[PDB]
Amino acid sequence: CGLVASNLNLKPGECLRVRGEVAPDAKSFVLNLGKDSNNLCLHFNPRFNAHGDANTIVCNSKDGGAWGTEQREAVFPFQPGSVAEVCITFDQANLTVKLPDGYEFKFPNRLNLEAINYMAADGDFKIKCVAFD
Amino acid sequence: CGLVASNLNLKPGECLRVRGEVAPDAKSFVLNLGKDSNNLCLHFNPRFNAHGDANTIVCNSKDGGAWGTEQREAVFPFQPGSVAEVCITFDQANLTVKLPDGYEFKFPNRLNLEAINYMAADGDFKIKCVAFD
Ligand SMILES: CCCO[C@@H]1O[C@H](CO)[C@@H](O[C@@H]2O[C@H](CO)[C@H](O)[C@H](OCc3cn(C)nn3)[C@H]2O)[C@H](O)[C@H]1NC(C)=O
Ligand SMILES: CCCO[C@@H]1O[C@H](CO)[C@@H](O[C@@H]2O[C@H](CO)[C@H](O)[C@H](OCc3cn(C)nn3)[C@H]2O)[C@H](O)[C@H]1NC(C)=O
């Protein structure tokens, strides 16, 4: 329902910087990354109040259409109705997700992707800027 | 084939900014904007040395798969081996294309689109940032 991008050609060590607006009534937003819509290295899902979670980031993978096992993070530097920037890089072992206010976490590269070509936003997150370092 | 973005929901008067690196041996690049690959309100094609043309911007539309009447511009503010920003807006009458070196031109809006939802880049231009005002 938000921006979808393909042919991103993001390679290991490169930095994808995504800035957007968190809706003021936000309950949840999503940023998906991977090979395509059925093969996600990162389903990144901050939940303000949704699917049974309060102020928790849920992450998952999707492999040939099948969801993996969710991982729940320990930090949440997002507020409804504000701008947020997320920066992502990956290597053979992990994606590294950098968040506002100095937070960051790692999520295993379960699909062993060597390139990230697909991104999609959904939920209460309006992308304003995508930049490639 | 370069970055493709959909669901852009660019409304009249909003600005789309694209910054990229022009290859040192560039021949031609394309930014396509519209609804989808068959419906382009703007095919923007700087030709450094391509199709018999030298340092000429070629523009066209595509409606239901059919190319419109091509137009050429009179200024070529691009250099191989350098970074360039392009900035595009639209209303019902025209698209306005703002380029480096202060140059700006209008191209008639020959489709009826409520919003620009699709953008594809191709050719000798590596996209470094995209912004939606
Ligand atoms: C009844 C629930 C109690 O159990 C829950 O069962 C839901 C449905 O399986 C899980 O939620 C699902 O988790 C998936 C990623 O793993 C995706 O996030 C799905 O959203 C897809 C989406 C949203 N957007 C905006 N775009 N795509 C989301 O519905 C949810 O974690 C889990 N909650 C828990 C265990 O506490
Ligand atoms: C005007 C009618 C007859 O004269 C020539 O007929 C070619 C093919 O009809 C035109 O070339 C075509 O112009 C189009 C935009 O009008 C697009 O740019 C096409 O490329 C689309 C594309 C392919 N790819 C891989 N990426 N982009 C390009 O092939 C060429 O300008 C044209 N005019 C001149 C003076 O030369």
PDB file of N, CA, C and O in Angstrom, chain B residues 44-103:
ATOM      1  N   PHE B  44      11.864  10.691 -20.456  1.00  0.00           N
ATOM      2  CA  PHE B  44      12.887  11.736 -20.422  1.00  0.00           C
ATOM      3  C   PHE B  44      14.195  11.071 -20.787  1.00  0.00           C
ATOM      4  O   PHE B  44      14.699  10.241 -20.021  1.00  0.00           O
ATOM      5  N   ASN B  45      14.783  11.408 -21.922  1.00  0.00           N
ATOM      6  CA  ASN B  45      15.896  10.644 -22.487  1.00  0.00           C
ATOM      7  C   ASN B  45      17.006  11.570 -22.966  1.00  0.00           C
ATOM      8  O   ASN B  45      17.085  11.911 -24.159  1.00  0.00           O
ATOM      9  N   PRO B  46      17.912  11.970 -22.072  1.00  0.00           N
ATOM     10  CA  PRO B  46      19.138  12.640 -22.518  1.00  0.00           C
ATOM     11  C   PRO B  46      20.009  11.687 -23.314  1.00  0.00           C
ATOM     12  O   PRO B  46      20.371  10.609 -22.840  1.00  0.00           O
ATOM     13  N   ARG B  47      20.331  12.092 -24.547  1.00  0.00           N
ATOM     14  CA  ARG B  47      21.161  11.324 -25.461  1.00  0.00           C
ATOM     15  C   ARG B  47      22.478  12.071 -25.602  1.00  0.00           C
ATOM     16  O   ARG B  47      22.520  13.167 -26.180  1.00  0.00           O
ATOM     17  N   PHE B  48      23.533  11.504 -25.024  1.00  0.00           N
ATOM     18  CA  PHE B  48      24.872  12.042 -25.208  1.00  0.00           C
ATOM     19  C   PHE B  48      25.355  11.726 -26.611  1.00  0.00           C
ATOM     20  O   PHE B  48      25.772  12.618 -27.360  1.00  0.00           O
ATOM     21  N   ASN B  49      25.261  10.459 -26.993  1.00  0.00           N
ATOM     22  CA  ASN B  49      25.647   9.999 -28.326  1.00  0.00           C
ATOM     23  C   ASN B  49      24.874   8.689 -28.522  1.00  0.00           C
ATOM     24  O   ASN B  49      25.357   7.611 -28.178  1.00  0.00           O
ATOM     25  N   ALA B  50      23.657   8.813 -29.039  1.00  0.00           N
ATOM     26  CA  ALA B  50      22.766   7.673 -29.185  1.00  0.00           C
ATOM     27  C   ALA B  50      21.701   8.017 -30.219  1.00  0.00           C
ATOM     28  O   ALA B  50      21.221   9.155 -30.274  1.00  0.00           O
ATOM     29  N   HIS B  51      21.338   7.025 -31.038  1.00  0.00           N
ATOM     30  CA  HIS B  51      20.286   7.182 -32.046  1.00  0.00           C
ATOM     31  C   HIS B  51      20.616   8.282 -33.053  1.00  0.00           C
ATOM     32  O   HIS B  51      19.723   8.939 -33.596  1.00  0.00           O
ATOM     33  N   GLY B  52      21.900   8.492 -33.319  1.00  0.00           N
ATOM     34  CA  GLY B  52      22.329   9.548 -34.209  1.00  0.00           C
ATOM     35  C   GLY B  52      22.321  10.933 -33.601  1.00  0.00           C
ATOM     36  O   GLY B  52      22.674  11.900 -34.294  1.00  0.00           O
ATOM     37  N   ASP B  53      21.944  11.061 -32.332  1.00  0.00           N
ATOM     38  CA  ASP B  53      21.809  12.346 -31.668  1.00  0.00           C
ATOM     39  C   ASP B  53      22.991  12.580 -30.740  1.00  0.00           C
ATOM     40  O   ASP B  53      23.560  11.640 -30.177  1.00  0.00           O
ATOM     41  N   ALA B  54      23.368  13.850 -30.607  1.00  0.00           N
ATOM     42  CA  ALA B  54      24.481  14.250 -29.761  1.00  0.00           C
ATOM     43  C   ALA B  54      23.989  15.339 -28.827  1.00  0.00           C
ATOM     44  O   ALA B  54      23.386  16.321 -29.275  1.00  0.00           O
ATOM     45  N   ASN B  55      24.218  15.144 -27.535  1.00  0.00           N
ATOM     46  CA  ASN B  55      23.886  16.138 -26.517  1.00  0.00           C
ATOM     47  C   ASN B  55      22.519  16.763 -26.748  1.00  0.00           C
ATOM     48  O   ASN B  55      22.357  17.986 -26.780  1.00  0.00           O
ATOM     49  N   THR B  56      21.513  15.878 -26.838  1.00  0.00           N
ATOM     50  CA  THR B  56      20.132  16.295 -27.020  1.00  0.00           C
ATOM     51  C   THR B  56      19.218  15.559 -26.049  1.00  0.00           C
ATOM     52  O   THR B  56      19.319  14.340 -25.900  1.00  0.00           O
ATOM     53  N   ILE B  57      18.333  16.308 -25.419  1.00  0.00           N
ATOM     54  CA  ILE B  57      17.294  15.719 -24.585  1.00  0.00           C
ATOM     55  C   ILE B  57      16.107  15.437 -25.485  1.00  0.00           C
ATOM     56  O   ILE B  57      15.536  16.363 -26.090  1.00  0.00           O
ATOM     57  N   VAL B  58      15.699  14.186 -25.534  1.00  0.00           N
ATOM     58  CA  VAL B  58      14.501  13.730 -26.234  1.00  0.00           C
ATOM     59  C   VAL B  58      13.447  13.425 -25.194  1.00  0.00           C
ATOM     60  O   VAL B  58      13.730  12.712 -24.212  1.00  0.00           O
ATOM     61  N   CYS B  59      12.244  13.909 -25.395  1.00  0.00           N
ATOM     62  CA  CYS B  59      11.121  13.613 -24.533  1.00  0.00           C
ATOM     63  C   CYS B  59       9.949  13.069 -25.355  1.00  0.00           C
ATOM     64  O   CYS B  59       9.730  13.452 -26.520  1.00  0.00           O
ATOM     65  N   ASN B  60       9.140  12.203 -24.745  1.00  0.00           N
ATOM     66  CA  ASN B  60       7.936  11.685 -25.401  1.00  0.00           C
ATOM     67  C   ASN B  60       6.998  11.224 -24.307  1.00  0.00           C
ATOM     68  O   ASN B  60       7.360  11.226 -23.121  1.00  0.00           O
ATOM     69  N   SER B  61       5.780  10.878 -24.722  1.00  0.00           N
ATOM     70  CA  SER B  61       4.799  10.176 -23.903  1.00  0.00           C
ATOM     71  C   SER B  61       4.533   8.800 -24.508  1.00  0.00           C
ATOM     72  O   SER B  61       4.977   8.487 -25.638  1.00  0.00           O
ATOM     73  N   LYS B  62       3.881   7.950 -23.714  1.00  0.00           N
ATOM     74  CA  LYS B  62       3.420   6.639 -24.171  1.00  0.00           C
ATOM     75  C   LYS B  62       2.032   6.439 -23.605  1.00  0.00           C
ATOM     76  O   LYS B  62       1.813   6.555 -22.395  1.00  0.00           O
ATOM     77  N   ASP B  63       1.062   6.201 -24.476  1.00  0.00           N
ATOM     78  CA  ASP B  63      -0.320   6.076 -24.035  1.00  0.00           C
ATOM     79  C   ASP B  63      -0.848   4.728 -24.487  1.00  0.00           C
ATOM     80  O   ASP B  63      -0.974   4.481 -25.685  1.00  0.00           O
ATOM     81  N   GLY B  64      -1.178   3.872 -23.535  1.00  0.00           N
ATOM     82  CA  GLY B  64      -1.675   2.554 -23.925  1.00  0.00           C
ATOM     83  C   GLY B  64      -0.718   1.830 -24.845  1.00  0.00           C
ATOM     84  O   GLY B  64      -1.161   1.176 -25.802  1.00  0.00           O
ATOM     85  N   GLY B  65       0.581   1.946 -24.615  1.00  0.00           N
ATOM     86  CA  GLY B  65       1.579   1.278 -25.420  1.00  0.00           C
ATOM     87  C   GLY B  65       2.059   2.069 -26.630  1.00  0.00           C
ATOM     88  O   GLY B  65       3.038   1.665 -27.246  1.00  0.00           O
ATOM     89  N   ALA B  66       1.393   3.150 -26.988  1.00  0.00           N
ATOM     90  CA  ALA B  66       1.718   3.887 -28.210  1.00  0.00           C
ATOM     91  C   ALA B  66       2.557   5.117 -27.872  1.00  0.00           C
ATOM     92  O   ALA B  66       2.110   5.998 -27.123  1.00  0.00           O
ATOM     93  N   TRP B  67       3.724   5.193 -28.480  1.00  0.00           N
ATOM     94  CA  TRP B  67       4.553   6.381 -28.343  1.00  0.00           C
ATOM     95  C   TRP B  67       3.871   7.574 -28.972  1.00  0.00           C
ATOM     96  O   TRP B  67       3.291   7.464 -30.047  1.00  0.00           O
ATOM     97  N   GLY B  68       3.940   8.705 -28.308  1.00  0.00           N
ATOM     98  CA  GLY B  68       3.426   9.953 -28.833  1.00  0.00           C
ATOM     99  C   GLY B  68       4.403  10.633 -29.779  1.00  0.00           C
ATOM    100  O   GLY B  68       5.316  10.013 -30.325  1.00  0.00           O
ATOM    101  N   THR B  69       4.156  11.926 -29.980  1.00  0.00           N
ATOM    102  CA  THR B  69       5.025  12.766 -30.798  1.00  0.00           C
ATOM    103  C   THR B  69       6.230  13.253 -29.979  1.00  0.00           C
ATOM    104  O   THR B  69       6.067  13.945 -28.981  1.00  0.00           O
ATOM    105  N   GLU B  70       7.402  12.844 -30.408  1.00  0.00           N
ATOM    106  CA  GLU B  70       8.654  13.217 -29.759  1.00  0.00           C
ATOM    107  C   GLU B  70       8.906  14.699 -29.835  1.00  0.00           C
ATOM    108  O   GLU B  70       8.574  15.345 -30.840  1.00  0.00           O
ATOM    109  N   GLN B  71       9.557  15.234 -28.810  1.00  0.00           N
ATOM    110  CA  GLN B  71      10.022  16.611 -28.813  1.00  0.00           C
ATOM    111  C   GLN B  71      11.445  16.636 -28.330  1.00  0.00           C
ATOM    112  O   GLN B  71      11.836  15.831 -27.472  1.00  0.00           O
ATOM    113  N   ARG B  72      12.217  17.572 -28.829  1.00  0.00           N
ATOM    114  CA  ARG B  72      13.594  17.776 -28.395  1.00  0.00           C
ATOM    115  C   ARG B  72      13.787  19.145 -27.774  1.00  0.00           C
ATOM    116  O   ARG B  72      13.162  20.130 -28.185  1.00  0.00           O
ATOM    117  N   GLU B  73      14.630  19.194 -26.751  1.00  0.00           N
ATOM    118  CA  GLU B  73      14.935  20.447 -26.072  1.00  0.00           C
ATOM    119  C   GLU B  73      16.225  21.065 -26.604  1.00  0.00           C
ATOM    120  O   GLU B  73      16.937  20.487 -27.427  1.00  0.00           O
ATOM    121  N   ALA B  74      16.484  22.298 -26.178  1.00  0.00           N
ATOM    122  CA  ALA B  74      17.541  23.092 -26.786  1.00  0.00           C
ATOM    123  C   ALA B  74      18.791  23.226 -25.934  1.00  0.00           C
ATOM    124  O   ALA B  74      19.776  23.806 -26.402  1.00  0.00           O
ATOM    125  N   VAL B  75      18.790  22.682 -24.703  1.00  0.00           N
ATOM    126  CA  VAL B  75      19.879  22.823 -23.731  1.00  0.00           C
ATOM    127  C   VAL B  75      20.189  21.445 -23.171  1.00  0.00           C
ATOM    128  O   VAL B  75      19.274  20.644 -22.961  1.00  0.00           O
ATOM    129  N   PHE B  76      21.470  21.176 -22.913  1.00  0.00           N
ATOM    130  CA  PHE B  76      21.922  19.869 -22.474  1.00  0.00           C
ATOM    131  C   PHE B  76      22.845  20.043 -21.289  1.00  0.00           C
ATOM    132  O   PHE B  76      24.074  20.030 -21.429  1.00  0.00           O
ATOM    133  N   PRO B  77      22.282  20.190 -20.095  1.00  0.00           N
ATOM    134  CA  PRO B  77      23.073  20.496 -18.901  1.00  0.00           C
ATOM    135  C   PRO B  77      23.544  19.250 -18.177  1.00  0.00           C
ATOM    136  O   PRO B  77      23.385  19.140 -16.973  1.00  0.00           O
ATOM    137  N   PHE B  78      24.125  18.304 -18.920  1.00  0.00           N
ATOM    138  CA  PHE B  78      24.675  17.069 -18.368  1.00  0.00           C
ATOM    139  C   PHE B  78      26.067  16.885 -18.939  1.00  0.00           C
ATOM    140  O   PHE B  78      26.338  17.289 -20.076  1.00  0.00           O
ATOM    141  N   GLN B  79      26.931  16.252 -18.161  1.00  0.00           N
ATOM    142  CA  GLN B  79      28.305  15.958 -18.553  1.00  0.00           C
ATOM    143  C   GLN B  79      28.611  14.515 -18.167  1.00  0.00           C
ATOM    144  O   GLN B  79      28.337  14.113 -17.032  1.00  0.00           O
ATOM    145  N   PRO B  80      29.119  13.683 -19.060  1.00  0.00           N
ATOM    146  CA  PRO B  80      29.594  12.361 -18.636  1.00  0.00           C
ATOM    147  C   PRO B  80      30.556  12.468 -17.462  1.00  0.00           C
ATOM    148  O   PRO B  80      31.346  13.409 -17.364  1.00  0.00           O
ATOM    149  N   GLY B  81      30.449  11.518 -16.530  1.00  0.00           N
ATOM    150  CA  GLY B  81      31.359  11.467 -15.412  1.00  0.00           C
ATOM    151  C   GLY B  81      31.045  12.418 -14.289  1.00  0.00           C
ATOM    152  O   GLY B  81      31.942  12.774 -13.510  1.00  0.00           O
ATOM    153  N   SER B  82      29.797  12.841 -14.162  1.00  0.00           N
ATOM    154  CA  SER B  82      29.445  13.792 -13.130  1.00  0.00           C
ATOM    155  C   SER B  82      28.077  13.457 -12.557  1.00  0.00           C
ATOM    156  O   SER B  82      27.278  12.740 -13.161  1.00  0.00           O
ATOM    157  N   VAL B  83      27.804  14.033 -11.429  1.00  0.00           N
ATOM    158  CA  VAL B  83      26.528  13.858 -10.735  1.00  0.00           C
ATOM    159  C   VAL B  83      25.550  14.881 -11.268  1.00  0.00           C
ATOM    160  O   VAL B  83      25.914  16.046 -11.523  1.00  0.00           O
ATOM    161  N   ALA B  84      24.296  14.460 -11.409  1.00  0.00           N
ATOM    162  CA  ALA B  84      23.231  15.334 -11.869  1.00  0.00           C
ATOM    163  C   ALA B  84      21.957  15.078 -11.099  1.00  0.00           C
ATOM    164  O   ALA B  84      21.602  13.920 -10.832  1.00  0.00           O
ATOM    165  N   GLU B  85      21.241  16.142 -10.782  1.00  0.00           N
ATOM    166  CA  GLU B  85      19.912  16.065 -10.195  1.00  0.00           C
ATOM    167  C   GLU B  85      18.857  16.511 -11.190  1.00  0.00           C
ATOM    168  O   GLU B  85      19.017  17.527 -11.871  1.00  0.00           O
ATOM    169  N   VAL B  86      17.758  15.800 -11.220  1.00  0.00           N
ATOM    170  CA  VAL B  86      16.572  16.136 -11.989  1.00  0.00           C
ATOM    171  C   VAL B  86      15.401  16.280 -11.047  1.00  0.00           C
ATOM    172  O   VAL B  86      15.238  15.456 -10.151  1.00  0.00           O
ATOM    173  N   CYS B  87      14.502  17.231 -11.274  1.00  0.00           N
ATOM    174  CA  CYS B  87      13.432  17.594 -10.344  1.00  0.00           C
ATOM    175  C   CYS B  87      12.207  17.783 -11.210  1.00  0.00           C
ATOM    176  O   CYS B  87      12.202  18.592 -12.125  1.00  0.00           O
ATOM    177  N   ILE B  88      11.160  17.036 -10.921  1.00  0.00           N
ATOM    178  CA  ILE B  88       9.967  17.000 -11.765  1.00  0.00           C
ATOM    179  C   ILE B  88       8.729  17.230 -10.950  1.00  0.00           C
ATOM    180  O   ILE B  88       8.579  16.689  -9.866  1.00  0.00           O
ATOM    181  N   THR B  89       7.858  18.104 -11.477  1.00  0.00           N
ATOM    182  CA  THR B  89       6.509  18.322 -10.962  1.00  0.00           C
ATOM    183  C   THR B  89       5.527  18.246 -12.130  1.00  0.00           C
ATOM    184  O   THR B  89       5.916  18.115 -13.291  1.00  0.00           O
ATOM    185  N   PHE B  90       4.240  18.323 -11.814  1.00  0.00           N
ATOM    186  CA  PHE B  90       3.235  18.340 -12.870  1.00  0.00           C
ATOM    187  C   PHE B  90       1.940  18.958 -12.367  1.00  0.00           C
ATOM    188  O   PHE B  90       1.664  18.999 -11.170  1.00  0.00           O
ATOM    189  N   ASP B  91       1.166  19.467 -13.322  1.00  0.00           N
ATOM    190  CA  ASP B  91      -0.241  19.840 -13.155  1.00  0.00           C
ATOM    191  C   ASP B  91      -1.003  19.228 -14.334  1.00  0.00           C
ATOM    192  O   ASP B  91      -0.431  18.450 -15.106  1.00  0.00           O
ATOM    193  N   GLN B  92      -2.288  19.551 -14.510  1.00  0.00           N
ATOM    194  CA  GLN B  92      -3.016  18.901 -15.598  1.00  0.00           C
ATOM    195  C   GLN B  92      -2.496  19.326 -16.969  1.00  0.00           C
ATOM    196  O   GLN B  92      -2.631  18.564 -17.931  1.00  0.00           O
ATOM    197  N   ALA B  93      -1.880  20.505 -17.077  1.00  0.00           N
ATOM    198  CA  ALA B  93      -1.442  21.002 -18.367  1.00  0.00           C
ATOM    199  C   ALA B  93      -0.046  20.530 -18.746  1.00  0.00           C
ATOM    200  O   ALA B  93       0.187  20.152 -19.891  1.00  0.00           O
ATOM    201  N   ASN B  94       0.909  20.564 -17.825  1.00  0.00           N
ATOM    202  CA  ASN B  94       2.288  20.285 -18.181  1.00  0.00           C
ATOM    203  C   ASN B  94       3.011  19.566 -17.055  1.00  0.00           C
ATOM    204  O   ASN B  94       2.666  19.692 -15.888  1.00  0.00           O
ATOM    205  N   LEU B  95       4.051  18.849 -17.447  1.00  0.00           N
ATOM    206  CA  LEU B  95       5.114  18.509 -16.519  1.00  0.00           C
ATOM    207  C   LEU B  95       6.165  19.605 -16.612  1.00  0.00           C
ATOM    208  O   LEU B  95       6.446  20.116 -17.707  1.00  0.00           O
ATOM    209  N   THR B  96       6.746  19.967 -15.457  1.00  0.00           N
ATOM    210  CA  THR B  96       7.868  20.904 -15.408  1.00  0.00           C
ATOM    211  C   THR B  96       9.100  20.127 -14.972  1.00  0.00           C
ATOM    212  O   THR B  96       9.097  19.495 -13.903  1.00  0.00           O
ATOM    213  N   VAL B  97      10.138  20.184 -15.790  1.00  0.00           N
ATOM    214  CA  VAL B  97      11.397  19.467 -15.560  1.00  0.00           C
ATOM    215  C   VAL B  97      12.474  20.502 -15.274  1.00  0.00           C
ATOM    216  O   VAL B  97      12.775  21.341 -16.126  1.00  0.00           O
ATOM    217  N   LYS B  98      13.060  20.431 -14.098  1.00  0.00           N
ATOM    218  CA  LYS B  98      14.113  21.337 -13.655  1.00  0.00           C
ATOM    219  C   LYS B  98      15.422  20.571 -13.595  1.00  0.00           C
ATOM    220  O   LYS B  98      15.483  19.472 -13.021  1.00  0.00           O
ATOM    221  N   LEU B  99      16.436  21.111 -14.237  1.00  0.00           N
ATOM    222  CA  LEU B  99      17.694  20.422 -14.489  1.00  0.00           C
ATOM    223  C   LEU B  99      18.848  21.211 -13.900  1.00  0.00           C
ATOM    224  O   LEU B  99      18.642  22.283 -13.316  1.00  0.00           O
ATOM    225  N   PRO B 100      20.064  20.705 -13.997  1.00  0.00           N
ATOM    226  CA  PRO B 100      21.215  21.489 -13.523  1.00  0.00           C
ATOM    227  C   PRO B 100      21.388  22.771 -14.313  1.00  0.00           C
ATOM    228  O   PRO B 100      20.767  22.995 -15.344  1.00  0.00           O
ATOM    229  N   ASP B 101      22.298  23.628 -13.831  1.00  0.00           N
ATOM    230  CA  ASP B 101      22.703  24.838 -14.541  1.00  0.00           C
ATOM    231  C   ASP B 101      21.525  25.779 -14.797  1.00  0.00           C
ATOM    232  O   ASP B 101      21.525  26.543 -15.767  1.00  0.00           O
ATOM    233  N   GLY B 102      20.527  25.705 -13.921  1.00  0.00           N
ATOM    234  CA  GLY B 102      19.366  26.567 -13.918  1.00  0.00           C
ATOM    235  C   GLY B 102      18.334  26.299 -14.997  1.00  0.00           C
ATOM    236  O   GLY B 102      17.377  27.065 -15.109  1.00  0.00           O
ATOM    237  N   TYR B 103      18.498  25.263 -15.808  1.00  0.00           N
ATOM    238  CA  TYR B 103      17.622  25.064 -16.945  1.00  0.00           C
ATOM    239  C   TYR B 103      16.344  24.374 -16.519  1.00  0.00           C
ATOM    240  O   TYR B 103      16.362  23.425 -15.741  1.00  0.00           O
TER     241      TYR B 103
END
